[PDB]
Chains A and B, each alone.
Chain A
Amino acid sequence: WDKDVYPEPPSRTPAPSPQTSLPNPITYLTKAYDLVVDWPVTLVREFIERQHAKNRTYYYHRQYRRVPDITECKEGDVLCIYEAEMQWRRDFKVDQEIMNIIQERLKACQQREGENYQQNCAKELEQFTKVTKAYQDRYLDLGAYYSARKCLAKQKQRMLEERKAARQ
């Protein structure tokens, strides 16, 4: 849980503020649950975590050095085009995961706000809208055979259109 990438507003639970002579069943059920279930389970988990502390091992997130883009490839030079295309595919799916993370933020915001979502989730709705516009302008209408070259052609079509609009 990286709170940054997965923002989570603070908790604001209120006071017990009881006004009834009767006993709330929930507190006693929760005490029984705690003692009976949570405690042994926590013991087991602590034992596993000690066993993990023993025999600790490490794994590293892979780093992929950048390589020339398809823009730097001479037509029909399959050798460089392959590397450019693979780089583009990796960037494509990293963008996919960006979209997943932002959509998860939006869903969590909706659930958290509840019936205030029509106002308090405006920030995340705005972020979602901007990122989906970016995603549409990057990868949409590209066939199932999407490729760096198709993306480049689409971008250049849009840039030609924008240049025309600016001229006019």
Chain B
Amino acid sequence: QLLREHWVHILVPAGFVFGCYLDRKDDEKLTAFRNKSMLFQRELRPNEEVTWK
């Protein structure tokens, strides 16, 4: 099969996918002040959970 060497094409896009996931994790850890900042603090709208998730 030509996958023999066309498998290599999945590395870089996998790099992008993995980087995006890790960015989401990085933003997860920094949750405090999620909605506790003077400018932007608000009461959540009805039927809502997280402001910026």
Using a CB–CB cutoff of 8 Å, the interface residues on chain A facing chain B are: 64-65, 67-68, 80, 83, 86-87
Contact = CB atoms under 8 A, between A and B. Distances in A.
Contacts of B39: 64-65, 67, 83, 86-87
Contacts of A67: 38-39
Interface in B1-53: 37-39
A68 B37 CA distance: 11
Closest 6 CB pairs of A and B: A67-B38, A67-B39, A83-B38, A65-B39, A83-B39, A64-B39
Contacts of B38: 65, 67-68, 80, 83
A2 to B, nearest CB: 27
Nearest to B40: A65
A64 B37 CA distance: 12
Nearest to A67: B38
B50 to A, nearest CB: 20
A64 B39 CA distance: 7
A80 B37 CA distance: 9
A64 B42 CA distance: 12
Contacts of A68: 38
A10 B37 CA distance: 49
A68 B41 CA distance: 14
Contacts of A80: 38
12 contacts: A64-B39, A65-B38, A65-B39, A67-B38, A67-B39, A68-B38, A80-B38, A83-B37, A83-B38, A83-B39, A86-B39, A87-B39
Nearest to B38: A67
A58 to B, nearest CB: 18
A86 B38 CA distance: 12
A68 B38 CA distance: 8
Nearest to A80: B38
A83 B39 CA distance: 8
Nearest to B33: A79
Nearest to A68: B38
Contacts of A83: 37-39
A86 B37 CA distance: 13
